[PDB]
Swiss-Prot record:
Subcellular location: Virion; Host nucleus; Host cytoplasm
Regions annotated as coiled coil: none
Protein name: Integrase
Residues that bind Mg(2+) 3: 27, 89
Gene behind this protein: pol
Full protein: residues contained: 848 to 946 of 1143
Phylogenetic placement of the source organism: Viruses, Riboviria, Pararnavirae, Artverviricota, Revtraviricetes
DNA sequence: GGGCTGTGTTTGTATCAAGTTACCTGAATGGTAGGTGGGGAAGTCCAAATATTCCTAGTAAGACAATTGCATTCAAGGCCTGGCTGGTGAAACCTGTTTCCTGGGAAG
């Protein structure tokens, strides 16, 4: 067990999966902060909410990727309509028990 | 002559600290190798200190004049002291919450 946890596999994973598109908009949002960018107006982080139906991006810049900076960023966007599913990454701000 | 407040002397216990230690880790030491910093010796040049006089300006002084400063008296106001009332500050009790509090940890 000194040689099992250092050598890496020479066996690639198989074919990638293409999951199907949803059949309506407002079904899957794919959200991920970008940044730290170069600063402007006291902003560094930009929430990016892509619709999984189309590609229709939504931008909601914030000061710092906290939980509450995301929550008010979607209250603008939940004013439009309500999604069923929101995908993300396992972010520092999304995995919080508050969010 | 008397009085008031400060002061002192003695006791008990609670609290605070003194005590000794157990460990356990943090840190404190020992032995070494390396390079670097600094310390030391030198020199041409550099800046200040002196010896001088000279002249001049203001320093020093003597006189005078008048204001100010001082010392006293006057007048009363302001503040200190105390007899009193009560509203809050503090000490003891209880806690939930909040924040930290480094510390570790995950994830983008
Ligand atoms: Mg990301």
């Amino acid at each position: 067990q000194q040689c099992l946890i250092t050598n890496a596999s020479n066996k690639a994973s198989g074919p990638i999966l293409r999951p199907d598109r949803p059949q309506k908009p407002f079904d899957k949002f794919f959200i991920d902060y970008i940044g730290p960018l170069p600063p402007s107006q006291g902003y560094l982080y930009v929430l990016v909410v892509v619709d999984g139906m189309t590609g229709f991006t939504w931008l909601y810049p914030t000061k710092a990727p906290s939980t509450s900076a995301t929550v008010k960023s979607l209250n603008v966007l939940t004013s439009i309509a309500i999604p069923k599913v929101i995908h993300s990454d396992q972010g520092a701000a999304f995995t919080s028990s508050t969010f």
